[PDB]
Enzyme design. Structure first.
Site, PDB file in Angstrom:
ATOM      1  N   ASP A  35      -8.669  -3.273   3.102  1.00  0.00           N
ATOM      2  CA  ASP A  35      -7.166  -4.464   3.667  1.00  0.00           C
ATOM      3  C   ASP A  35      -8.801  -5.410   2.883  1.00  0.00           C
ATOM      4  O   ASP A  35      -9.895  -4.472   3.726  1.00  0.00           O
ATOM      5  CB  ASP A  35      -6.664  -4.702   4.350  1.00  0.00           C
ATOM      6  CG  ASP A  35      -5.753  -6.168   4.139  1.00  0.00           C
ATOM      7  OD1 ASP A  35      -5.953  -6.495   2.539  1.00  0.00           O
ATOM      8  OD2 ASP A  35      -5.000  -6.050   5.041  1.00  0.00           O
ATOM      9  N   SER A  36      -8.732  -6.367   2.663  1.00  0.00           N
ATOM     10  CA  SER A  36     -10.254  -7.313   1.777  1.00  0.00           C
ATOM     11  C   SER A  36     -10.033  -7.935   3.572  1.00  0.00           C
ATOM     12  O   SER A  36     -11.396  -8.666   3.532  1.00  0.00           O
ATOM     13  CB  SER A  36      -9.007  -8.289   1.060  1.00  0.00           C
ATOM     14  OG  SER A  36      -8.622  -9.203   0.923  1.00  0.00           O
TER      15      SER A  36
ATOM     16  N   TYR B 255      -5.514 -10.829   5.861  1.00  0.00           N
ATOM     17  CA  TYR B 255      -4.498 -10.458   6.767  1.00  0.00           C
ATOM     18  C   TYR B 255      -5.138 -11.668   8.203  1.00  0.00           C
ATOM     19  O   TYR B 255      -4.166 -12.106   8.589  1.00  0.00           O
ATOM     20  CB  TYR B 255      -4.020  -9.301   7.516  1.00  0.00           C
ATOM     21  CG  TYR B 255      -2.580  -9.400   8.504  1.00  0.00           C
ATOM     22  CD1 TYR B 255      -1.717  -9.586   7.897  1.00  0.00           C
ATOM     23  CD2 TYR B 255      -3.319  -8.898   9.530  1.00  0.00           C
ATOM     24  CE1 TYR B 255      -1.245  -9.641   8.412  1.00  0.00           C
ATOM     25  CE2 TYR B 255      -2.162  -9.400  10.326  1.00  0.00           C
ATOM     26  CZ  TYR B 255      -1.000  -9.621   9.989  1.00  0.00           C
ATOM     27  OH  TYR B 255       0.160  -9.412  11.151  1.00  0.00           O
TER      28      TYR B 255
ATOM     29  N   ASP C  28      -7.961 -12.004  -0.598  1.00  0.00           N
ATOM     30  CA  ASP C  28      -6.749 -13.635  -0.692  1.00  0.00           C
ATOM     31  C   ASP C  28      -6.592 -14.118   0.422  1.00  0.00           C
ATOM     32  O   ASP C  28      -6.936 -13.997   1.942  1.00  0.00           O
ATOM     33  CB  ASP C  28      -5.676 -12.253  -0.938  1.00  0.00           C
ATOM     34  CG  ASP C  28      -4.698 -11.834   0.275  1.00  0.00           C
ATOM     35  OD1 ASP C  28      -5.863 -11.346   0.973  1.00  0.00           O
ATOM     36  OD2 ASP C  28      -3.723 -12.133   0.839  1.00  0.00           O
TER      37      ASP C  28
ATOM     38  N   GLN D  57       0.711 -13.896  -3.814  1.00  0.00           N
ATOM     39  CA  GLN D  57       1.122 -14.452  -2.792  1.00  0.00           C
ATOM     40  C   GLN D  57       2.295 -15.177  -3.499  1.00  0.00           C
ATOM     41  O   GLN D  57       2.961 -15.526  -4.194  1.00  0.00           O
ATOM     42  CB  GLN D  57      -0.073 -15.388  -2.706  1.00  0.00           C
ATOM     43  CG  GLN D  57      -1.299 -14.744  -1.657  1.00  0.00           C
ATOM     44  CD  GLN D  57      -0.804 -14.268   0.092  1.00  0.00           C
ATOM     45  OE1 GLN D  57       0.131 -14.257   0.224  1.00  0.00           O
ATOM     46  NE2 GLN D  57      -1.787 -12.647  -0.411  1.00  0.00           N
TER      47      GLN D  57
ATOM     48  N   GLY E 162       1.822 -11.975   1.711  1.00  0.00           N
ATOM     49  CA  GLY E 162       2.412 -12.982   1.974  1.00  0.00           C
ATOM     50  C   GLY E 162       4.098 -12.750   3.105  1.00  0.00           C
ATOM     51  O   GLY E 162       4.686 -13.824   2.791  1.00  0.00           O
TER      52      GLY E 162
ATOM     53  N   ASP F 288       1.326   0.087   4.147  1.00  0.00           N
ATOM     54  CA  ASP F 288       0.614   0.272   5.336  1.00  0.00           C
ATOM     55  C   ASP F 288       1.199  -0.638   6.826  1.00  0.00           C
ATOM     56  O   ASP F 288       1.773  -1.912   5.972  1.00  0.00           O
ATOM     57  CB  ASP F 288      -0.532  -0.367   5.317  1.00  0.00           C
ATOM     58  CG  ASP F 288      -0.681  -1.665   5.307  1.00  0.00           C
ATOM     59  OD1 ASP F 288      -0.707  -2.412   4.324  1.00  0.00           O
ATOM     60  OD2 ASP F 288      -1.348  -2.540   5.967  1.00  0.00           O
TER      61      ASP F 288
ATOM     62  N   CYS G  69      13.224  15.789  14.097  1.00  0.00           N
ATOM     63  CA  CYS G  69      11.351  15.822  13.915  1.00  0.00           C
ATOM     64  C   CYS G  69      10.940  17.499  13.423  1.00  0.00           C
ATOM     65  O   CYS G  69      10.717  17.810  14.734  1.00  0.00           O
ATOM     66  CB  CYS G  69      11.023  15.241  14.403  1.00  0.00           C
ATOM     67  SG  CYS G  69       9.103  14.721  14.378  1.00  0.00           S
TER      68      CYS G  69
ATOM     69  N   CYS H 107       7.206  17.539  13.666  1.00  0.00           N
ATOM     70  CA  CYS H 107       6.708  17.355  14.302  1.00  0.00           C
ATOM     71  C   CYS H 107       5.718  17.842  15.792  1.00  0.00           C
ATOM     72  O   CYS H 107       6.652  18.632  15.981  1.00  0.00           O
ATOM     73  CB  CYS H 107       6.236  15.686  14.992  1.00  0.00           C
ATOM     74  SG  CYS H 107       6.343  15.323  16.420  1.00  0.00           S
TER      75      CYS H 107
ATOM     76  N   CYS I 197       7.664  16.599  19.123  1.00  0.00           N
ATOM     77  CA  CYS I 197       9.035  17.374  19.145  1.00  0.00           C
ATOM     78  C   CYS I 197       9.402  18.461  19.197  1.00  0.00           C
ATOM     79  O   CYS I 197      10.351  19.354  19.719  1.00  0.00           O
ATOM     80  CB  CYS I 197       9.457  17.578  18.264  1.00  0.00           C
ATOM     81  SG  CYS I 197      10.153  15.522  18.242  1.00  0.00           S
TER      82      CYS I 197
ATOM     83  N   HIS J  99       3.751  11.711  16.871  1.00  0.00           N
ATOM     84  CA  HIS J  99       5.191  11.738  16.305  1.00  0.00           C
ATOM     85  C   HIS J  99       5.460  10.420  15.363  1.00  0.00           C
ATOM     86  O   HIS J  99       6.450  10.458  14.293  1.00  0.00           O
ATOM     87  CB  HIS J  99       6.277  11.843  17.503  1.00  0.00           C
ATOM     88  CG  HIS J  99       8.207  11.514  17.533  1.00  0.00           C
ATOM     89  ND1 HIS J  99       8.794  12.377  16.781  1.00  0.00           N
ATOM     90  CD2 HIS J  99       8.327   9.963  17.415  1.00  0.00           C
ATOM     91  CE1 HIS J  99       9.623  11.813  16.262  1.00  0.00           C
ATOM     92  NE2 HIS J  99       9.550  10.985  16.565  1.00  0.00           N
TER      93      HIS J  99
HETATM   94  N1  9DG Z   1      -4.941  -9.002   2.561  1.00  0.00           N
HETATM   95  C1  9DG Z   1      -3.721  -8.729   2.751  1.00  0.00           C
HETATM   96  N2  9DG Z   1      -3.420  -8.439   4.228  1.00  0.00           N
HETATM   97  C2  9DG Z   1      -2.132  -8.383   4.410  1.00  0.00           C
HETATM   98  C3  9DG Z   1      -1.776  -7.222   4.938  1.00  0.00           C
HETATM   99  C4  9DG Z   1       0.082  -7.961   5.370  1.00  0.00           C
HETATM  100  N3  9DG Z   1      -0.216  -9.180   4.421  1.00  0.00           N
HETATM  101  C5  9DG Z   1      -0.821  -9.331   4.092  1.00  0.00           C
HETATM  102  C6  9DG Z   1      -1.112  -9.941   2.912  1.00  0.00           C
HETATM  103  O1  9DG Z   1      -0.614 -10.513   2.947  1.00  0.00           O
HETATM  104  N4  9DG Z   1      -2.919 -10.135   2.169  1.00  0.00           N
HETATM  105 ZN    ZN Z   2       8.135  14.318  16.072  1.00  0.00          ZN
END
Ligand code: 9DG
Ligand code: ZN
Length: 376
Positions: free
Chosen positions: A92-93, A96, A146, A193, A220, A270, A308, A310, A313, A339
């Site tokens: 991720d950049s 966030y 961003d 965004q 966003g 994610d 599950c 896993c 479990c 889990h």
């Molecule tokens: N780069 C970036 N990461 C995340 C993670 C959650 N939302 C964002 C977002 O809007 N921009």
């Molecule tokens: Zn499990």
RNA sequence: AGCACGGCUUAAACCGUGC
């Protein structure tokens, strides 16, 4: 082996399942990417992560930049080698943190100046720098720099923020392309965004499509507007993105959130929910979430979840795991996390199969039913 | 400390509420 090749193999409504082919591996979609911020997926060995079913994990630019350092990881042979995970990694950049660490932040057209949340030291995170770090780490899917706009947001703030981001997007695309070493092996995603205002969302999407990205993410959201609002924004935002490209919804976990997002065209997710909750004692199951700390589990021989597949479990009981979390035992975190993540993977397996059979829409309905019922 | 619960959408093996 291809650099980046997205292929939809099945569809149902807005939802669709397929795969993304990259040099380091294949990524089945819809996919859930576990979060491994500081070069580690909390409490799990890479082999364990892979065992649950994940095809790609995710690392964070801002954090790794501070520790153990970008240049240093580069020197030690790259992120993959460093942490022992050779399959594709998405970084991720740091956009966030621009939000979650606002208090320690100072924004400007150049980028955002962060005050190390652990060192106090000053740092300039510009679009160019963000891309250089991701290169140094050697990530496979690079995210544009961003500003995850905070919520609520006036149409004014949301617009300036978005527009500066789109400009940052272009700069990112140029940074990425400047290094052939990178542009020939990695993939670049842009982030949309505009908060919850569709006119802004459209505008952002168009800027993104104009620059051109290997994948488009929607940022966003899931920042305090609630599921109703989120699904409402997604309703019109996802369609604004290139249909033949993968759609990535950032920071979204929580079983029902994912299912709904998939119903609206999202391909990747994610989220820290499964790992953080695992550590706090919250387990995710087909019958809603359950707090293992609760008294009702002190002598419950049953596994966390009845379905599950896993490893946890198949062996340990709720009673053992109950004791563990309560005692403060690390194994407790280990078991819980494994889990929650395998479950998230099993849920993704289900979502993918149903779409293949043309019975996803149904699966979603049956899912919420049981889930929100909470008979675990 | 402890007990009964809640929250969590990586400054979180955390935070909060009640006894
Ligand atoms: N780069 C970036 N990461 C995340 C993670 C959650 N939302 C964002 C977002 O809007 N921009
Ligand atoms: Zn499990």
């Amino acid at each position: 082996r291809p650099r980046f090749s997205f292929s939809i193999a099945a569809r149902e409504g807005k939802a669709r399942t397929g795969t993304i082919e990259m040099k380091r591996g294949v990524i089945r979609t819809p996919a859930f990417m576990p979060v491994g911020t500081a070069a580690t997926v909390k409490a799990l060995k890479p082999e364990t992560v892979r065992a649950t079913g994940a095809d790609i994990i995710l690392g964070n630019t801002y954090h790794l930049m501070l520790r153990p350092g970008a240049e240093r990881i580069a020197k030690l042979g790259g992120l993959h080698s460093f942490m022992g995970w050779d399959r594709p990694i998405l970084t991720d950049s740091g956009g966030y943190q621009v939000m979650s660490l606002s208090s320690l932040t100072k924004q400007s057209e150049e980028g955002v100046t962060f005050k190390s949340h652990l060192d106090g030291s000053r740092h300039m995170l510009s679009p160019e720098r963000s891309i250089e770090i991701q290169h140094l780490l050697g990530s496979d899917i690079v995210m544009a720099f961003d500003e995850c706009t905070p919520y609520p947001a006036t149409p004014s703030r949301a617009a300036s923020s978005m527009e500066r981001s789109m400009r940052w997007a272009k700069r990112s695309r140029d940074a990425f392309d400047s290094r052939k070493e990178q542009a020939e092996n990695a993939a670049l995603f842009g982030i949309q965004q505009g908060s919850v205002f569709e006119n802004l969302r459209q505008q952002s999407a168009d800027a993104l499509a104009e620059i051109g990205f290997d994948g488009y993410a929607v940022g966003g959201l899931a920042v305090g507007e609630g599921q109703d609002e989120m699904f409402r924004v997604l309703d019109f935002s996802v369609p604004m993105l290139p249909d033949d490209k993968p759609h990535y919804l950032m920071g979204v976990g929580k079983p029902d959130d994912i299912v709904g997002a998939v119903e609206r065209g999202i391909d990747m997710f994610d989220c820290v929910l499964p790992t953080r909750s695992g550590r706090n004692g919250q387990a995710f199951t087909w019958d809603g979430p359950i707090n293992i700390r609760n008294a009702r589990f002190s002598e419950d021989l049953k596994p966390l979840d009845s379905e599950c597949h896993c490893a946890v479990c198949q062996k340990w009981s709720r009673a053992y795991i109950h004791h563990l979390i309560r005692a403060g035992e690390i194994l407790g975190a280990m078991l819980m996390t494994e889990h929650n993540i395998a479950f998230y993977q099993q849920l993704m397996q289900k979502i993918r199969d149903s779409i293949s059979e043309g019975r996803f829409s149904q699966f979603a309905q049956d899912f919420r039913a049981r889930y929100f019922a909470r008979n675990s």
